[PDB]
Amino acid sequence: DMADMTIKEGFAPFGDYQTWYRITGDLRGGGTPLVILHGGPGCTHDYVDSFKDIANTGRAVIHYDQLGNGKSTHLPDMGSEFWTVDLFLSELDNLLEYLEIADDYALLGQSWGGMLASEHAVLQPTGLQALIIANSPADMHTWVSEANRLREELPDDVQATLLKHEEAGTLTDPAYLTASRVFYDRHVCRITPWPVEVERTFHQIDEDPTVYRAMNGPTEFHVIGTMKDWSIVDRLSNINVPTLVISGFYDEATPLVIQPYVDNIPDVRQSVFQESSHMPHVEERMACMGRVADFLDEVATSG
Secondary structure (H helix, E strand, C coil), X not given: CCHHHCEEEXXXXXXXXXXXXXXXXXXXXXXXXXXXXXXXCCCCCHHHHHHHXXXXXXXXXXXXXXXXXCCCCCCCCCCCCCCCHHHXXXXXXXXXXXXXXXXXXXXXXXXXXXXXXXXXXXXXXXXXXXXXXXXXXXXXXHHHHHHHHHHCCCCHHHHHHHHHHHHXXXXXXXXXXXXXXXXXHHHCCCCCCCCHHXXXXXXXXXXXXXXXXXXXCCCCCCCCCCCCCCECHHHHHHCCCCEEEEEXXXXXXXXXXXXXXXXXXXXXXXXXXXXXXXXXXXXXXXXXXXXXXXXXXXXXXXX
């Protein structure tokens, strides 16, 4: 159990850049290590910190900050053309080989992280043992369509504020950003005030929004960046590992948003957290870690 309480941190060189990572638990004596892929794109590991809990079940948990934010290399001079799915797929492959876990690993992807994990898994990598897709879309048009449906349930002045600034392009106006937080408090994180580790991620986006603005947009629901037309639906059937899909009752990743993962991955099961929105890992932490840990014990390798 002492081995399960180990922490190590480092940088994986990635081209001229640095990928920060953290390893919690027993990397070599434990079971299949679990790599946590944060969302955004352009978020950080901080708001998905809570998955370190899985280390107490006897496998290591690997966090890392994707290139462009957090403790990894920042590149604010890079625009929409640099920040691509292929860039982050390459960074993930680089980290896996650097830690020498590419023969035996599992991925948990949260929101964008699940999109990225699915892009990785539809290539059928041989060392992948298991996939968790948490609060993710399979088609960005569905994400926005369902976001719009949820926006029609916001207070009328709030939706009016959002539309006015989206039509004018004043996407940094405090009125727009505070109107946005009404949606977030319903469908992104219902813990109020936010856990500090969730705040740490959102503060880092505010400090350097380069990636999130390029690939996503100004807010979770106003997706105008380069991911706005993304879809993996038709390729999902290529995923050849056991997959777990989790989501929250109040999730901006509504049942329709996540449904293609359930419908198209051959070996899939689903769990729902009724008191959660987009972040069951902090909204219903005990239940969420227990389900992920049990799933990995069932399908991956143990020690």
